[PDB]
Amino acid sequence: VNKAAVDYFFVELHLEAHYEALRHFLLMEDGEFAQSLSDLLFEKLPGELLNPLVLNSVLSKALQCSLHGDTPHASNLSLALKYLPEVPDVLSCLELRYKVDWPLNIVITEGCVSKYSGVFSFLLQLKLMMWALKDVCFHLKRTAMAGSVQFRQLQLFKHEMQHFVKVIQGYIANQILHVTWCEFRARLALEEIQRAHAEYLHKAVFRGLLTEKAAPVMNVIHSIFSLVLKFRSQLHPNFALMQQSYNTFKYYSHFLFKVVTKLVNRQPHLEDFLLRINFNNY
Amino acid sequence: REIITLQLGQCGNQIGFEFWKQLCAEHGISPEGIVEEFTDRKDVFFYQYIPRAVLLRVIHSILNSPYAKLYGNNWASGFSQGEKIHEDIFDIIDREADGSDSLEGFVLCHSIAGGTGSGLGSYLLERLNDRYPKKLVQTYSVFPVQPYNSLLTLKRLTQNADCLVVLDNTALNRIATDRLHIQSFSQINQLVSTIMSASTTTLRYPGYMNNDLIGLIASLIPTPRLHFLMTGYTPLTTVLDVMRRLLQPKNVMVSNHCYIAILNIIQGEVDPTQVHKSLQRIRERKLANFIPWGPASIQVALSRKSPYLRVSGLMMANHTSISSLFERTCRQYDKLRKREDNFDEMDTSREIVQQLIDEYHAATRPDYIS
Amino acid sequence: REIITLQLGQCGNQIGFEFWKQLCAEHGISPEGIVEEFTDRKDVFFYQYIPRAVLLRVIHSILNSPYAKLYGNNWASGFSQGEKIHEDIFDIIDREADGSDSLEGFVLCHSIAGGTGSGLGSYLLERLNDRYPKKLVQTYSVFPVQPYNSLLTLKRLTQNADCLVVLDNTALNRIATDRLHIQSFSQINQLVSTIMSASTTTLRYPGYMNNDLIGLIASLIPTPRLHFLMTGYTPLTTVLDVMRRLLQPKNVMVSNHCYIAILNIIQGEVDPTQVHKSLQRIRERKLANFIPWGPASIQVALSRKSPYLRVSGLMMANHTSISSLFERTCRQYDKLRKREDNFDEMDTSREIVQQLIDEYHAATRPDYIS
Numbered sequence A: 001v002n003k004a005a006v007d008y009f010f011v012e013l014h015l016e017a018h019y020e021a022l023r024h025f026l027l028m029e030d031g032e033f034a035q036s037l038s039d040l041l042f043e044k045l046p047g048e049l050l051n052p053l054v055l056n057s058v059l060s061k062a063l064q065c066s067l068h069g070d071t072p073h074a075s076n077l078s079l080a081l082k083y084l085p086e087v088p089d090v091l092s093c094l095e096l097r098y099k100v101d102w103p104l105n106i107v108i109t110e111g112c113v114s115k116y117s118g119v120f121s122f123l124l125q126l127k128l129m130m131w132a133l134k135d136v137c138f139h140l141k142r143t144a145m146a147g148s149v150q151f152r153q154l155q156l157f158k159h160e161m162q163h164f165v166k167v168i169q170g171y172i173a174n175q176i177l178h179v180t181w182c183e184f185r186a187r188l189a190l191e192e193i194q195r196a197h198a199e200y201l202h203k204a205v206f207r208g209l210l211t212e213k214a215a216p217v218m219n220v221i222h223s224i225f226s227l228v229l230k231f232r233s234q235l236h237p238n239f240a241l242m243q244q245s246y247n248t249f250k251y252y253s254h255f256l257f258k259v260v261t262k263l264v265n266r267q268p269h270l271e272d273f274l275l276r277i278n279f280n281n282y
Numbered sequence B, C: 001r002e003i004i005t006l007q008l009g010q011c012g013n014q015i016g017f018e019f020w021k022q023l024c025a026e027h028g029i030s031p032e033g034i035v036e037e038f039t040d041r042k043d044v045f046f047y048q049y050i051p052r053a054v055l056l057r058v059i060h061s062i063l064n065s066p067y068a069k070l071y072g073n074n075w076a077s078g079f080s081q082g083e084k085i086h087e088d089i090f091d092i093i094d095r096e097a098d099g100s101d102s103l104e105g106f107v108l109c110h111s112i113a114g115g116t117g118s119g120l121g122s123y124l125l126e127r128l129n130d131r132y133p134k135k136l137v138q139t140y141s142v143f144p145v146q147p148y149n150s151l152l153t154l155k156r157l158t159q160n161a162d163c164l165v166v167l168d169n170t171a172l173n174r175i176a177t178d179r180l181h182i183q184s185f186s187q188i189n190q191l192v193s194t195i196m197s198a199s200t201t202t203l204r205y206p207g208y209m210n211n212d213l214i215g216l217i218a219s220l221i222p223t224p225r226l227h228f229l230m231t232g233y234t235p236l237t238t239v240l241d242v243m244r245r246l247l248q249p250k251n252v253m254v255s256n257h258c259y260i261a262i263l264n265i266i267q268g269e270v271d272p273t274q275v276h277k278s279l280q281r282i283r284e285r286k287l288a289n290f291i292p293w294g295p296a297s298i299q300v301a302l303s304r305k306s307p308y309l310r311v312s313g314l315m316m317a318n319h320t321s322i323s324s325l326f327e328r329t330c331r332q333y334d335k336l337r338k339r340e341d342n343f344d345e346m347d348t349s350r351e352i353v354q355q356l357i358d359e360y361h362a363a364t365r366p367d368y369i370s
Ligand SMILES: Nc1nc2c(ncn2[C@@H]2O[C@H](COP(=O)(O)OP(=O)(O)O)[C@@H](O)[C@H]2O)c(=O)[nH]1
Pocket: B008, B009, B010, B011, B014, B015, B072, B111, B113, B114, B115, B116, B117, B118, B142, B143, B144, B169, B185, B186, B188, B189
């Protein structure tokens, strides 16, 4: 029966495909998709952007710009929500759930997919920086004749704030997508499939600074992300109001390097972070 | 977002041709611009296949090549000819512009070694900032009355081109005699086309980070002035082998001092578990030196080779040693200034570059701010 | 723990190829550096298959052989060239070091008589101690204006190379006549390769001890001064049969006196039970004299002959009679000194080698200590 069950799947209708497909969509591994989904949603920002006429349709417009997908796997991307927002912050709650059928639902647990939604809302929140920060980099371009100390000293802040985001992202693009994927790909090749999958994702949420153990490391990240959003509000009528903001940024970043170091004595995953945030500095 | 290229002078049309050969080889595209049987997004460079090329003598031999189905000596004269055909040539740009879905940038392949294109290059960049103010422009200029035409185009490239990849023929020929033993033009460009091809590895193949031309440039170039880059390409074997062979001055395509930002592109299927280890050994041995003021790091991203065609790697850097190359040029100018309608444009050109040479030397000080 | 091998000079580059064609033959390695079908640990000399070699006119002769895919005459003249290609070769060496997992030593093949060797071999040993301080540098040097090149080099090998094995061409040319009947260089090298091959037998096959170059040398050299060895190859049958032929000076390539420590290597399948019986009769006969001051012992080790290719034998000897060969050379040096910028470096070199010959002549006394 089993030999006839597995054979029925290949020659007529791919567990190895579903994993390497959900990663293309949920974990945002496939570019030109997250850079097209998040880019659309961020163009708007209440009663709008919440009815099933825009957010249930922005996905069907997103997949066309993916250049990878549009397969039977590519469907079943219910872009639903789980909260009704009332009204500068760094939060926009929104889920993205995969869907499966019977002979595969018994392996991919209905709790494991729920944890993808946990790691997804973080990764999307990261894109909100590299777009808003890209905006001020593009918003300032049209300002160019106007060359003075007030101008050049201002733009050095962006290069100083962008680099911190482009390094914390480079970390995520190394742990949760490449090394944790090296395992569970050369690991597989029936009970084991449940545990191996329960160990693949669990390492993805562990190396992802979402675990409550290293939660204080995550709490400080919001202070960084918040100040960059304020920096986007002030798109030189109020230069000094921005000069104080950057000085708060350099303090918090200088505080992160100490709280991570003190948390080394008590986790080899965090070891690579200090080598990322610190390089020829203190 | 679509990318379009422009090739000027004799040099640009030559290396751009081999650039089109090597790139057409990466995908399953026959020389006759037809896909053969035999993932890779081929829409950024090709338009249904038709390449978005704009070619401005050798053109006759280019059509005489099997790839036909794939489409004076002063500076002021090169600038005059660009004005005489102002509207005639520009229509090609516009019709290719809006006919495209969403233009992202403008790749410019040209030489500044006294050619009619060298002036021709100076004119286009002025108008490209006039008409389209929301379109990035990148230029893969190449370095060698030659002092004159060289220093002049530098006046335009420092305020129009938001990025630049320098390639000096001098440091190239050193690689030619040493590791190819040529002792020609079509011989050195074989390696040059290789640098440009791998330079867009993250664009033609989708990845997580850096999925657009603004994704690569925005990290390195800190200010609209310090906007000069150099390249490296080691395969001519683990990760610690690649990055260590890149930082050597024997491989750099350039003839205190420190780096501002590095970008290393790995194209192989290497085990990604060791990429952090190589980063540790490079730090501890202190093989490279960075700026003291701001926290400057080195970034690496992975991609996949063309399955049709071994571990390759590209190194992209913004080194303040590039200031020395200018000093070699402008020094020749003062010597030619004393040896030979207003001759005033040559003054402001010499003036503005000397501001740039001041801007580099000021970046290496721990108090670069203010 | 891999060992990077370097080869300098004509003699050094010639013996290495014959050492390489011998080694890859013992394994199932095709001349195309590919494994053939046809347990043997092959990591110590090969990288994943390529040998970790760095070869430095004769190169053309090597590339013309079917093994192509396997990879003046004055002391002052040779050195001057070294400092001029200082940076060029170290990037070749450094990249091979970072490529290896845990580099352990440096095997070098060069001839003191060979001009290039007397000029370039001497320069590396000082730089190798400067850059990498925690790496042993062992050389398979071979003794032959001729005395000058020899003594000047010995000044470096006594303070830089922490180990050394000497191969005298005089005794080798002799052995060629009596038991081989040749009368050229191309015939005597056959036996040279046999020595180097069997010298590293215990490392290429998994055993109990002797799993590193340190595992062999540390028992031989007690003091930083006494660092000269000698070899002996008998087969040109029990375990007692092979040892009685080792201690005869009729087979040792050499031209009171006593040893320091002996290392025996057996490449046959002899019964390892009667080896303790053989040693007892040797102590009874008292065939070799020893030092009374310090504790020493005679050692023996077993291995397996290459199956893809009967009992062989190689012995490592640390004899004080090797000091005589130095005296003969330095005697001729003083002979040319009285017959013919500062002429002072050749003066201090004669003094420091005086300490070496003194240390050995004082080693054969009951009061060698202090
Ligand atoms: N790097 C490189 N430079 C080239 C090549 N071909 C020509 N050049 C440069 O182009 C310059 C000659 O320009 P030329 O073709 O006379 O200008 P034009 O006649 O206006 O196109 C020389 O100084 C060369 O350095 C090439 O294949 N590679």
